[PDB]
Design a protein around this nucleic acid. Structure first.
Ligand SMILES: [K+]
Ligand SMILES: [K+]
Ligand SMILES: [K+]
Ligand SMILES: [K+]
Ligand SMILES: [K+]
Ligand SMILES: [K+]
Ligand SMILES: [K+]
Ligand SMILES: [K+]
Ligand SMILES: [K+]
Ligand SMILES: [K+]
Ligand SMILES: [K+]
Ligand SMILES: [K+]
Ligand SMILES: [K+]
Ligand SMILES: [K+]
Ligand SMILES: [K+]
Ligand SMILES: [K+]
Ligand SMILES: [K+]
Ligand SMILES: [K+]
Ligand SMILES: [K+]
Ligand SMILES: [K+]
Ligand SMILES: [K+]
Ligand SMILES: [K+]
Ligand SMILES: [K+]
Ligand SMILES: [K+]
Ligand SMILES: [K+]
Ligand SMILES: [K+]
Ligand SMILES: [K+]
Ligand SMILES: [K+]
Ligand SMILES: [K+]
Ligand SMILES: [K+]
Ligand SMILES: [K+]
Ligand SMILES: [K+]
Ligand SMILES: [K+]
Ligand SMILES: [Mg+2]
Ligand SMILES: [Mg+2]
Ligand SMILES: [Mg+2]
Ligand SMILES: [Mg+2]
Ligand SMILES: [Mg+2]
Ligand SMILES: [Mg+2]
Ligand SMILES: [Mg+2]
Ligand SMILES: [Mg+2]
Ligand SMILES: [Mg+2]
Ligand SMILES: [Mg+2]
Ligand SMILES: [Mg+2]
Ligand SMILES: [Mg+2]
Ligand SMILES: [Mg+2]
Ligand SMILES: [Mg+2]
Ligand SMILES: [Mg+2]
Ligand SMILES: [Mg+2]
Ligand SMILES: [Mg+2]
Ligand SMILES: [Mg+2]
Ligand SMILES: [Mg+2]
Ligand SMILES: [Mg+2]
Ligand SMILES: [Mg+2]
Ligand SMILES: [Mg+2]
Ligand SMILES: [Mg+2]
Ligand SMILES: [Mg+2]
Ligand SMILES: [Mg+2]
Ligand SMILES: [Mg+2]
Ligand SMILES: [Mg+2]
Ligand SMILES: [Mg+2]
Ligand SMILES: [Mg+2]
Ligand SMILES: [Mg+2]
Ligand SMILES: [Mg+2]
Ligand SMILES: [Mg+2]
Ligand SMILES: [Mg+2]
Ligand SMILES: [Mg+2]
Ligand SMILES: [Mg+2]
Ligand SMILES: [Mg+2]
Ligand SMILES: [Mg+2]
Ligand SMILES: [Mg+2]
Ligand SMILES: [Mg+2]
Ligand SMILES: [Mg+2]
Ligand SMILES: [Mg+2]
Ligand SMILES: [Mg+2]
Ligand SMILES: [Mg+2]
Ligand SMILES: [Mg+2]
Ligand SMILES: [Mg+2]
Ligand SMILES: [Mg+2]
Ligand SMILES: [Mg+2]
Ligand SMILES: [Mg+2]
Ligand SMILES: [Mg+2]
Ligand SMILES: [Mg+2]
Ligand SMILES: [Mg+2]
Ligand SMILES: [Mg+2]
Ligand SMILES: [Mg+2]
Ligand SMILES: [Mg+2]
Ligand SMILES: [Mg+2]
Ligand SMILES: [Mg+2]
Ligand SMILES: [Mg+2]
Ligand SMILES: [Mg+2]
Ligand SMILES: [Mg+2]
Ligand SMILES: [Mg+2]
Ligand SMILES: [Mg+2]
Ligand SMILES: [Mg+2]
Ligand SMILES: [Mg+2]
Ligand SMILES: [Mg+2]
Ligand SMILES: [Mg+2]
Ligand SMILES: [Mg+2]
Ligand SMILES: [Mg+2]
Ligand SMILES: [Mg+2]
Ligand SMILES: [Mg+2]
Ligand SMILES: [Mg+2]
Ligand SMILES: [Mg+2]
Ligand SMILES: [Mg+2]
Ligand SMILES: [Mg+2]
Ligand SMILES: [Mg+2]
Ligand SMILES: [Mg+2]
Ligand SMILES: [Mg+2]
Ligand SMILES: [Mg+2]
Ligand SMILES: [Mg+2]
Ligand SMILES: [Mg+2]
Ligand SMILES: [Mg+2]
Ligand SMILES: [Mg+2]
Ligand SMILES: [Mg+2]
Ligand SMILES: [Mg+2]
Ligand SMILES: [Mg+2]
Ligand SMILES: [Mg+2]
Ligand SMILES: [Mg+2]
Ligand SMILES: [Mg+2]
Ligand SMILES: [Mg+2]
Ligand SMILES: [Mg+2]
Ligand SMILES: [Mg+2]
Ligand SMILES: [Mg+2]
Ligand SMILES: [Mg+2]
Ligand SMILES: [Mg+2]
Ligand SMILES: [Mg+2]
Ligand SMILES: [Mg+2]
Ligand SMILES: [Mg+2]
Ligand SMILES: [Mg+2]
Ligand SMILES: [Mg+2]
Ligand SMILES: [Mg+2]
Ligand SMILES: [Mg+2]
Ligand SMILES: [Zn+2]
Lengths: 87, 155, 50
RNA sequence: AACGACUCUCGGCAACGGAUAUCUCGGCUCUCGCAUCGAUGAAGAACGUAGCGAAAUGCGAUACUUGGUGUGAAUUGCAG
RNA sequence: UUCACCAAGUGUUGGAUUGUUCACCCACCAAUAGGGAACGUGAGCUGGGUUUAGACCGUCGUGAGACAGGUUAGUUUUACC
RNA sequence: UGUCUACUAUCCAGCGAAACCACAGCCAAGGGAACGGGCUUGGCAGAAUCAGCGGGGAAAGAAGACCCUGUUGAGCUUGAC
RNA sequence: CCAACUCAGAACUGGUACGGACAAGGGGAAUCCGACUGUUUAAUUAAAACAAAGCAUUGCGAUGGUCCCAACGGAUGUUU
RNA sequence: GUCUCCAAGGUGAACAGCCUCUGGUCGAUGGAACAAUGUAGGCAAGGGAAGUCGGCAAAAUGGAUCCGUAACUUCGGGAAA
RNA sequence: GAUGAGUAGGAGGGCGCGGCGGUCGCUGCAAAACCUUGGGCGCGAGCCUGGGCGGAGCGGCCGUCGGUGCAGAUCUUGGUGGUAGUAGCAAAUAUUCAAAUGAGAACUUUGAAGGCCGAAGAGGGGAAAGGUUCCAUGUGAACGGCACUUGCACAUGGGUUAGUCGAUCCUAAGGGUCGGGGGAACCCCGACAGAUAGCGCGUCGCGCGUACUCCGAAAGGGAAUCGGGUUAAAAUUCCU
RNA sequence: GCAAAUCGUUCGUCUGACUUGGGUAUAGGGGCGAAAGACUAAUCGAACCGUCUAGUAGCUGGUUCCCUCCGAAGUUUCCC
RNA sequence: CCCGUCUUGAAACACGGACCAAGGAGUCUGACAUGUGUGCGAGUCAACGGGCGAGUAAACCCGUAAGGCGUAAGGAAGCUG
RNA sequence: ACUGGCGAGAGACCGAUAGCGAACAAGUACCGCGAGGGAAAGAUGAAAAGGACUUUGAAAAGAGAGUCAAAGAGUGCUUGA
């Protein structure tokens, strides 16, 4: 019964979707994400998984704000001014 | 496009082909092997008799385990033969297509005979079947290409 | 099930939208290599995992 | 012990398959320059967004973009 | 009845106890001779024994455990070449 | 031992795998890594094919678990360090 | 005036058939082991193995017995 | 393999088995033959465990009513003896 | 003039592959690769050449360099055979006739007949779980291990309406925590080392005040909806 | 193989140490165990995942072109 | 007689090998040693760095009491040489 | 000092089983409850000029014809072992 018959009882979810990382890794009874350790303030990262680090590191996502920092640096973060109107 | 064998007189010959036909290669080869060098009129009636289970197609090469029938003794002494209707249907359509090509060329249909016919293996198609102890095996089909040429009987 | 959360229902709605064939005019663009939708999902073949 | 079938064998052609050759907006390695994330809400995650789009790329209800400036006549698969 | 010769053509059995081979007894029979064939023969069977893992006894060992000692329960796979 | 029913097998239409495969596949004796399909000497030996069959292929399944070796382990024990 | 279905008996009758299908204990005389019901090696062992009530021994009067813990503390203990 | 609600008539002690109504359904690839071997279900003269490690398997018993019921016993049972 | 065996092993002289520094050339009047029952050279590794295919690169020589030579490793990845049209399709009692539709019907639909599930059902719902599988229309292929005009497949469009049904609220086993106590820190204990939360009544004042206003049940507790009708697909939700 | 444990008949129990859903607690030398070294996601006499790691191996297997020349040893001593 | 392989001994009833393509194994680095080629020679070495330079990761130049190795050994050492 | 980030130059490096796992909607599809695991997949032609039309077929498609230097380049299409 340990094999096929046992697999018939699979209607209780150990993990749900994590609010923070979105993986189906939020252990419900532990109230803890096995992927990102949410709700712990610090993210879950380990140097013994190089692949895991590069899956989730900076640049794998949208870089919504950080992508524009280099452009602003080139202008010395100038603000409060505009190009002279065309003549 | 290019057939394995070219007719001796292209002006007096017609041809037709079929590619990737969903029919067993081995069954179709046996049917083609029984039609070679046969008049078109006799070939059509012969295939129709196969569809009616009145004449059998002898199996000479891919014949292991094939049953024995009296309808095949005339062409194959040991009596191994079958009635591969599906193969006959595809070849019958090819013969009719070649006959129509003859009419456009204005050939003498009554004197036409099968001067060339061959079956080639086409690309295999893949399904799967389930085996004991949670194993998966291939479940393949063996389609074939068919080409034939009809030539007028020269006097 | 019939009892479902708002969050899950929203995720299922997005998956349905993504489960369509590519528009025909996509294959006629200049320098196009997209042949078909490589991420098609069937409810009975591959499960969503949530 | 002909003929023909079968088996094997040699050649022509046709199949099967994707090797070889020639390629390359990719990789790898070395060197150089620069020092710039975040409670003024980051990285990450989610959802939405086009006249016709699913993805990728972009963007945020001002949503494959607004504005300024530069360039100076296109965009383009189709339509308008 | 015994000894010996040609001789392997034909035959050489039914049972109690034992997993047995071996043995022993009862009974029949003309006779109940002895052997080989990978100690013939398990993709022919059977699995009683032996020879995994459970368990008990005796003896041995401080102990874990041991015993050509006894005991009981213990999956016998595939041919289409 | 006989016989009866059903479903298979069997024949057909359609569909259609896998294990396995050095090359291969008739025997006797001989010698040989001491038990040959191949070698030596003989018996012999005639296309293609069907249904069955378990003698053989020291058949398949698995880098023997038994035993031994290694200056390999591991579980457990104690008067070992 | 209106009642439901249990029991008992008699006559007659069929080719002795009649719980007519279905359903549904074989029985007896003993030995070994375990008292019994219960439990056990999911996928080779269901047992004589485990548990069991009963019996007996041991520690402890809380500044305590047994036990957990890196530390702080905690389980038995809503206890005696 | 996977929790739970509703539950007709007849036979009968009975949501036993067997048949039926409401509702559902003929979905399991089909055709032709009726060899061996097999799987499942049966039957059998006379004998009745001689089979086999062993009564394995099968057969036999079976409901209800009346009568009747031993050893032994912890007096409750045994007993549907 | 003499002489010639060789596993393990050593060494010499050569062949071949890809670059680099040089040098000498070839090529759309056809390079590389590949094919050949063409021919020739070398003991040999190999080399040269005819013909074909192909359509843009390539070679010789000197030196120098290297991820530089395969039959094996139960070798790696990919491809392909024999086996073989073979093993095999066999549980759950069962189908038959006529007609319609269609290129095509043992398998679609209608009607008739004969059977089965037999209310602890092969019937009618729901919780989990799935996520559009729901409904309509259409359909080339593929798929539904025979077939299909068929569809839980594919394509296009449509579809889920609540003060009363639930979640929501309450607390259970328990979970997460302040302060405090530990801890290099990640973390450990968990209202136990503590100026609780606030509430009530007047109109800002009085009174009260025992350290969690937290999470934890779509089967526990719990404010309130019933008929009748309505869709291709929704209803104790839409209409009355 | 319908099936990496199923099918047929036959069997044990069936008001209780009964069966079962959901919630919740215990996590790897740890848990849990009416005790079989059982069970802890087809994994248990120490799970699973990544890393240390290309772990070490006196042992098994393999080890890629041509000719030419020379051409062995299984014996000595010492060594867990 | 079938190749490859371990072996005193393989055609072996020893193991790997169904077939084809491509990939596939003594390398790089540090230290030392013998041999050989080359330069210089009681010396030798441009090595850290500097000066520059094919507008330049090369090449060219620089050792002024630098440093390495060598030029002197023996001794535990004090020392002597 | 600098195998991350941003920008830049270079190479006796690899040339689609190579080189980063990833030359391409690659950390993607897919697998696992989870920690994690993790592919395959580049080339028509100079230009789509991507094959009008006739005829056969239910359709796929074939035959003839057409475009092109070439369909012996016909939408996974250079060469094609
Ligand atoms: K046959
Ligand atoms: K031939
Ligand atoms: K190439
Ligand atoms: K924000
Ligand atoms: K702009
Ligand atoms: K056998
Ligand atoms: K048993
Ligand atoms: K058939
Ligand atoms: K012999
Ligand atoms: K162990
Ligand atoms: K009981
Ligand atoms: K205490
Ligand atoms: K039979
Ligand atoms: K007996
Ligand atoms: K050159
Ligand atoms: K040649
Ligand atoms: K070279
Ligand atoms: K449900
Ligand atoms: K509500
Ligand atoms: K509730
Ligand atoms: K209650
Ligand atoms: K109403
Ligand atoms: K029962
Ligand atoms: K462990
Ligand atoms: K050794
Ligand atoms: K070997
Ligand atoms: K050996
Ligand atoms: K071998
Ligand atoms: K010096
Ligand atoms: K200097
Ligand atoms: K001295
Ligand atoms: K790869
Ligand atoms: K071409
Ligand atoms: Mg398990
Ligand atoms: Mg849980
Ligand atoms: Mg929680
Ligand atoms: Mg057969
Ligand atoms: Mg199967
Ligand atoms: Mg399975
Ligand atoms: Mg599923
Ligand atoms: Mg998953
Ligand atoms: Mg964009
Ligand atoms: Mg005799
Ligand atoms: Mg003997
Ligand atoms: Mg024997
Ligand atoms: Mg045998
Ligand atoms: Mg056997
Ligand atoms: Mg035997
Ligand atoms: Mg036995
Ligand atoms: Mg035992
Ligand atoms: Mg003792
Ligand atoms: Mg025994
Ligand atoms: Mg012989
Ligand atoms: Mg042999
Ligand atoms: Mg001979
Ligand atoms: Mg013969
Ligand atoms: Mg057999
Ligand atoms: Mg045999
Ligand atoms: Mg073998
Ligand atoms: Mg071994
Ligand atoms: Mg082993
Ligand atoms: Mg060792
Ligand atoms: Mg030793
Ligand atoms: Mg040890
Ligand atoms: Mg006694
Ligand atoms: Mg008992
Ligand atoms: Mg159990
Ligand atoms: Mg068991
Ligand atoms: Mg059992
Ligand atoms: Mg007592
Ligand atoms: Mg302490
Ligand atoms: Mg009644
Ligand atoms: Mg009943
Ligand atoms: Mg009888
Ligand atoms: Mg009788
Ligand atoms: Mg009797
Ligand atoms: Mg007997
Ligand atoms: Mg006997
Ligand atoms: Mg006996
Ligand atoms: Mg019995
Ligand atoms: Mg009795
Ligand atoms: Mg020699
Ligand atoms: Mg070269
Ligand atoms: Mg040739
Ligand atoms: Mg050359
Ligand atoms: Mg290289
Ligand atoms: Mg190499
Ligand atoms: Mg090879
Ligand atoms: Mg070799
Ligand atoms: Mg191999
Ligand atoms: Mg392979
Ligand atoms: Mg094959
Ligand atoms: Mg068959
Ligand atoms: Mg079967
Ligand atoms: Mg049948
Ligand atoms: Mg049936
Ligand atoms: Mg049917
Ligand atoms: Mg029934
Ligand atoms: Mg019925
Ligand atoms: Mg009920
Ligand atoms: Mg089908
Ligand atoms: Mg539907
Ligand atoms: Mg769909
Ligand atoms: Mg309510
Ligand atoms: Mg509580
Ligand atoms: Mg906590
Ligand atoms: Mg605190
Ligand atoms: Mg307090
Ligand atoms: Mg509250
Ligand atoms: Mg709550
Ligand atoms: Mg409730
Ligand atoms: Mg409804
Ligand atoms: Mg079946
Ligand atoms: Mg612990
Ligand atoms: Mg238990
Ligand atoms: Mg044990
Ligand atoms: Mg691991
Ligand atoms: Mg290595
Ligand atoms: Mg020593
Ligand atoms: Mg030996
Ligand atoms: Mg050999
Ligand atoms: Mg031998
Ligand atoms: Mg070996
Ligand atoms: Mg082998
Ligand atoms: Mg190679
Ligand atoms: Mg030197
Ligand atoms: Mg000096
Ligand atoms: Mg002195
Ligand atoms: Mg940097
Ligand atoms: Mg790659
Ligand atoms: Mg290459
Ligand atoms: Mg080109
Ligand atoms: Mg090509
Ligand atoms: Zn997370």
């Amino acid at each position: 019964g340990k094999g096929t018959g046992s697999f018939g009882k699979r209607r209780n979810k150990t993990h749900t979707l994590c609010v923070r990382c979105g993986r189906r890794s939020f252990h419900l009874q532990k109230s803890r994400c096995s992927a990102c350790a949410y709700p712990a303030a610090r993210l879950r990262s380990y140097n013994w998984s190089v692949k895991a680090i590069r899956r989730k590191t900076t640049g794998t996502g949208r870089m919504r704000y950080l992508r524009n920092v280099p452009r602003r640096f080139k202008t010395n973060f100038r603000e409060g001014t505009e190009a002279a109107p065309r003549k | 496009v290019k057939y394995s064998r070219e007719p001796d007189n292209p002006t007096k010959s017609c041809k037709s082909r079929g590619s990737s036909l969903r029919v067993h290669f081995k069954n179709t080869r046996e049917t083609a092997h029984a039609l070679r060098k046969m008049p078109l009129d006799k070939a059509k009636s012969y295939l129709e008799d196969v569809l009616a289970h009145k004449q059998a197609i002898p199996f000479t090469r891919f014949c292991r385990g094939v049953g024995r029938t009296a309808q095949a003794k005339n062409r194959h002494s040991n009596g191994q033969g079958r009635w591969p209707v599906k193969s006959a249907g595809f070849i019958l359509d090819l013969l009719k297509n070649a006959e129509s090509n003859a009419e456009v060329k204005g050939l003498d249909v009554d004197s036409l005979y099968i001067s060339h016919i061959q079956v080639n293996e086409a690309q295999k198609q893949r399904r799967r079947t389930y085996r004991a102890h949670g194993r998966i095996n291939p479940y393949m089909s063996h389609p074939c290409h068919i080409e034939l040429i009809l030539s007028e009987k020269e006097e | 099930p019939s009892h479902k959360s708002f969050m899950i229902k929203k995720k299922l709605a997005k998956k349905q939208r993504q489960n369509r064939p590519i528009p025909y005019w996509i294959r006629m663009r200049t320098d196009n290599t997209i042949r078909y939708n490589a991420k098609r999902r069937h409810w009975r073949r591959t499960k969503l995992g949530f």
